[PDB]
């Protein structure tokens, strides 16, 4: 029993965190094979011209107490790739994946190439992440673990004026309409990740918290008209299908749970809580709920 | 900026998780140097669950009864002994991934990261606090026994908890790494209930300071209170009393924000009286009590 916000074990990623220094800027880098990936803003803007002026010896890369020899450098979008003379002996099986809004991932927050914390978060529909980051965390990565394969999905780049965070996939492409330049940028109005709220209600039913269940069902169209009104993301037929296994396990059809959600929005919680929370949680995907309520290991 | 429930990186602990099997029972073990620590109830049969005599059961066991598996390598158990409710299995190989470590016993209110494991394999990492009733509100399934709670001291891992059992309410009970249970719990199938849980008041105040550091000020007020008047209001809401030690521990946060402890205490009193009025603090509609003053300082500085 129990339901916690749970991150993937960070070991496989910790063995990849290195410190990257260029001039007065020190941030984190991801050492995979003989390549170190880090935000291109470490050279700081005309990034192509700035990188042309740089030499391999300008980049100081440190892995623990060993300095790595940079033997090449190139740029892929907003990420800098530093070729090094040594393959990371702790390189896990990995992939670079681009995630969608709603999908969750674990973040390994680092400072000076040293992992300090691991937390689970979701890529918000407005493409920001509500992370916890201080100065020096740039280069910290977001990942998922698929069987025994690390899927790198995020690299931290900056903090927006509201305190939310922005970053890129491991190919340097930003998530959202953000740029890595000191200019006024605002996150769009965020919305709630509806499929994740439904997944979290299933997790509550699995844990015995069932006060919110009602006799009602709804059509997907009627649910979406009501959800749109409360700044909730539309629920697609893909989401209904993904919630299938949880619907079968709990005996609560997706449209049946949608009518529970529909009432929770129009009426509130009435002083009651669900999984120790007075708000509807939207940072647990249907896969996270299944994984946590079935004990999948890594 | 931002405030998240943040666990310590679990790598140093993952390299210590092994699978321990004795008869039909399979749970997790912690491999440190040439010793594997695991809950002693792994040696229990079906009949010996309500009132097991662990000394008597362990005397009947031989080293060849314990199957220890570290990855795809079976470890040779060359000795066995019991320290309180923990079984110590000596093995013929020192764990090459043994980190710098200490065995620490924690107090209610203290937080720690939990590495949930199944069959000696880490599946998840989450943050926990030792509840005032000495239980932990974890997320555990059958097979999670032996999963450990830890904190990281720069390079050193302080092991503070080993999961043993789930109480009837769904909350969890366990021991320090010396086998001593936290709370009035025993590793027997006898009827056991957790006492009424209370809110870790000092942790709530630490969390309100974290909110002020993050720019949340709506809950602040012009009032101050005496420590005695705050404690009388707090107990009525099932909140732990706040001692002079807690006021002193909140000192650095009070200096950083410019809000005295008794000033924040009056804000907490007002919050308990009115509720949140549809507003949130750090994205939460409830007062969070699983961030210690030490966690808040660490995460904000
Ligand atoms: N120095 C960073 C930055 O703001 N990175 C930080 C990350 N997370 C949290 C931070 C909190 C405080 C200060 C800095 C933070 C930066 C600044 C401007 C731009 Cl346009 C870019 Cl791409 C990157
Ligand atoms: N079978 C275990 C147990 O309850 N261990 C589990 C741990 N966490 C969560 C669990 C959820 C479901 C089933 C089992 C769980 C057990 C039972 C009685 C006693 Cl007295 C002891 Cl020491 C240990
Ligand atoms: Cl699924
Ligand atoms: Cl008193």
Ligand 2 atom at minimal distance to the Cα of residue B164: 22
Answer yes or no: are the C-beta atoms of A129 and A123 closer than 8 Å: yes
List of chain B residues whose C-beta atoms are within 8 Å of the C-beta of residue A276: 137, 286
CA distances from A251 to A205, A256, B291 (A): 10, 10, 36
Nearest by Cα to A68 from A137, A119, A17, A136: A17
Our CA dihedral for B218, B220, B221, B225, rounded to 10 degrees, sits at: 150
N residues, chain A: 298
Instruction: List b or e across B63-92, with b for residues whose CB sees 16 or more CB atoms inside 10 angstroms.
Output: eeebebbbeeeebebeebebeebbbbbebe
| Chain B contact for A281 (CB, 8 A cutoff) | no
Q: Which of B197, B215, B243 is the last residue of a domain?
A: B197
Nearest by Cα to B41 from B191, B178, B147, B186: B186
CA angle B271, B272, B277 (to 5 degrees): 50
Residues B165 and B285 reside in one and the same domain: no
What CATH number is given to the structural domain containing B287?
A: 1.10.1840.10
DSSP A40: G
DSSP B7: B
Residues B177 and B124 reside in one and the same domain: yes
Residues 130-189 of A with CB under 8 A from B: 130-134, 159, 163-165
Half-sphere exposure of B220 (CA within 13 A, CB side): 15
Residues B2 and B123 reside in one and the same domain: yes
Q: Which of B180, B197, B214 is the last residue of a domain?
A: B197
Q: How far is the CA of B31 from the centre of ligand 3 (A)?
A: 34
Question: What 3-state DSSP class applies to B126?
Answer: strand
- What's the CA gap between B122 and A8, in Å, rounded? 9
Distance from CA of B274 to the nearest CA of A (A): 13
What CATH number is given to the structural domain containing B76?
A: 2.40.10.10
Residues A1 and A115 reside in one and the same domain: yes
Q: How far is the CA of A142 from the centre of ligand 2 (A)?
A: 33
Answer yes or no: are the C-beta atoms of A93 and A51 closer than 8 Å: no
Answer yes or no: are the C-beta atoms of A252 and A213 closer than 8 Å: yes
A110: nearest CA in chain B?
B9
Which residues crowd ion ligand 3, with CB under 5 Å?
A: A 245, 286, 290
As given in the structure block, the two tokens for residue B81 are: 């002994």
A279–B170 C-beta distance less than 8 A: no
Residues A134 and A4 reside in one and the same domain: yes
Residues B210 and B299 reside in one and the same domain: yes
Write out the residue range of the structural domain in which residue B152 sits: 1-14+100-197
Q: Is the CB of A182 under 6 A from ligand 1?
A: yes
Residues of A recognised as catalytic:
41, 138
Provide DSSP, B30-53: EEETTEEEEEGGGG--SSTTSS--
Residues B6 and B119 reside in one and the same domain: yes
**Method of elucidation:** X-ray
Distance from CA of B91 to the nearest CA of A (A): 24
As given in the structure block, the two tokens for residue B295 are: 């966690």
Answer yes or no: are the C-beta atoms of A37 and A79 closer than 8 Å: yes
Answer yes or no: are the C-beta atoms of B109 and B203 closer than 8 Å: yes
Answer yes or no: are the C-beta atoms of B135 and B173 closer than 8 Å: yes
| Chain B contact for A279 (CB, 8 A cutoff) | yes
Instruction: List b or e across B198-222, with b for residues whose CB sees 16 or more CB atoms inside 10 angstroms.
Output: bbbbbbbbbbbbbbbbbebeebbee
Instruction: Look at the block and give the residue holding tokens 């919305």.
Output: A191
Distance from CA of B101 to the nearest CA of A (A): 17
B280–A1 C-beta distance less than 8 A: no
- What's the CA gap between A146 and A167, in Å, rounded? 22
Which residues contact residue A153 at a Cβ distance below 8 angstroms, ignoring those fewer than 6 apart?
A96, A97, A98, A99, A103, A105, A123, A142, A143, A144, A169, A170
Residues 212-231 of B with CB under 8 A from A: 214-215
Residues A65 and A135 reside in one and the same domain: no
CA distances from A200 to A251, B120, B285 (A): 15, 27, 17
B38, B51, B117, B145: which to mutate for ligand 2, most atoms within 8 A of CB? B145
N residues, chain B: 301
Residues A3 and A102 reside in one and the same domain: yes
Over B211-233, what HEC string results? HHHCCCCCCCCCCCCCHHHHHHH
CA distances from B155 to A229, A258, B15 (A): 50, 47, 14
Which residues contact residue A100 at a Cβ distance below 8 angstroms, ignoring those fewer than 6 apart?
A123
Q: How far is the CA of B227 from the centre of ligand 4 (A)?
A: 8
CA-CA-CA-CA torsion sign (B23, B28, B33, B35): negative
Q: At what angle do helices B201-213 and B261-274 cross, to 10 degrees?
A: 100
Q: Is the CB of B173 under 6 A from ligand 2?
A: no
Phi, psi of A272, rounded to the nearest 5 degrees = -90, 165
| Facing A163 at nearest CB: one of B141, B214, B299 | B214
- What's the CA gap between B153 and B12, in Å, rounded? 12
Instruction: Look at the block and give the residue holding tokens 């291109």.
Output: A40
B1–A297 C-beta distance less than 8 A: no
A131–B172 C-beta distance less than 8 A: no
CA distances from B151 to A52, B19, B26, B128, B207 (A): 44, 22, 26, 11, 19
B117: nearest CA in chain A?
A297
CA distances from B182 to B105, B160, B191 (A): 9, 10, 17
A276–B286 C-beta distance less than 8 A: yes
| Facing B170 at nearest CB: one of A2, A165, A293 | A2
Nearest by Cα to B126 from A245, A291, A146, A110: A291
Residue B99 is inside which H or E element, if any? none
Which residues contact residue B168 at a Cβ distance below 8 angstroms, ignoring those fewer than 6 apart?
B192, B193
Residues B78 and B8 reside in one and the same domain: no
> In units of Å, what resolution does this entry have?
2.1
| Chain A contact for B43 (CB, 8 A cutoff) | no
> What are the strands of the beta sheet with A25-32, ordered from one edge?
A66-68, A59-63, A17-22, A25-32, A35-39, A79-84, A70-76
B124–A165 C-beta distance less than 8 A: no
What is the total count of domains within chain A? Answer: 3
Q: Which ligand is nearest to the CA of A44?
A: 1
Residues B115 and B180 reside in one and the same domain: yes
CA-CA-CA-CA torsion sign (B155, B161, B163, B164): positive
CA-CA-CA-CA torsion sign (B294, A109, A106, B98): negative
Q: Is the CB of A157 under 6 A from ligand 1?
A: yes
| Facing B14 at nearest CB: one of A9, A165, A296 | A9
As given in the structure block, the two tokens for residue B252 are: 């650095």
Residues B45 and B135 reside in one and the same domain: no
Question: What 3-state DSSP class applies to B300?
Answer: helix
Q: How far is CA B22 from the centre of its chain?
A: 26
CA distances from A64 to A31, A141, B272 (A): 12, 18, 47
Instruction: List b or e across A43-53, with b for residues whose CB sees 16 or more CB atoms inside 10 angstroms.
Output: beeebeeeeee
Distance from CA of A10 to the nearest CA of B (A): 6
Answer yes or no: are the C-beta atoms of B156 and A42 closer than 8 Å: no
Q: Which of A169, A190, A211 is the last residue of a domain?
A: A190
Residues 69-98 of B with CB under 8 A from A: none
């Amino acid at each position: 029993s129990g339901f916690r916000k749970m991150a993937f074990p960070s070991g496989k990623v910790e063995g990849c965190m290195v410190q990257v220094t260029c001039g007065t800027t020190t941030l984190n880098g991801l050492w995979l094979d003989d390549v170190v990936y880090c935000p291109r803003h470490v050279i700081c803007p005309n990034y192509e011209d700035l990188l042309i002026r740089k030499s391999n010896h300008n980049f100081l890369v440190q892995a623990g107490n060993v300095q790595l020899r940079v033997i090449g450098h190139s740029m892929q979008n907003c990420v800098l790739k530093l070729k090094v003379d040594t393959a990371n002996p702790k390189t896990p099986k990995y992939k670079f994946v681009r995630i969608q809004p709603g999908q969750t991932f674990s973040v390994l927050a680092c400072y000076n190439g040293s992992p300090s914390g691991v937390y689970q978060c979701a890529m918000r529909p407005n493409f920001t992440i509500k992370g916890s980051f201080l100065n020096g965390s740039c280069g910290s990565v977001g990942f998922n673990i698929d069987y025994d394969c690390v899927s790198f999905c995020y690299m931290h780049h900056m903090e927006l004026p509201t305190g939310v965070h922005a970053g890129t996939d491991l190919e340097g492409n930003f998530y959202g309409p953000f740029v890595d330049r000191q200019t006024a940028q605002a996150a769009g109005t965020d919305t709630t990740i509806t499929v994740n709220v439904l997944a979290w209600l299933y997790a509550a039913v699995i844990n015995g918290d069932r006060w919110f269940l009602n006799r009602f069902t709804t059509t997907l169209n009627d649910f979406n008209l009501v959800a749109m009104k409360y700044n909730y993301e539309p629920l697609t037929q893909d989401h209904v299908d993904i919630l299938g296994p949880l619907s079968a396990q709990t005996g609560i059809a997706v449209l049946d749970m949608c009518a529970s959600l529909k009432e929770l929005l129009q009426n509130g919680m009435n002083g009651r809580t669900i999984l120790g929370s007075a708000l509807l949680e939207d940072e647990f995907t249907p896969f996270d709920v299944v994984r946590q309520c079935s004990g999948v290991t890594f």
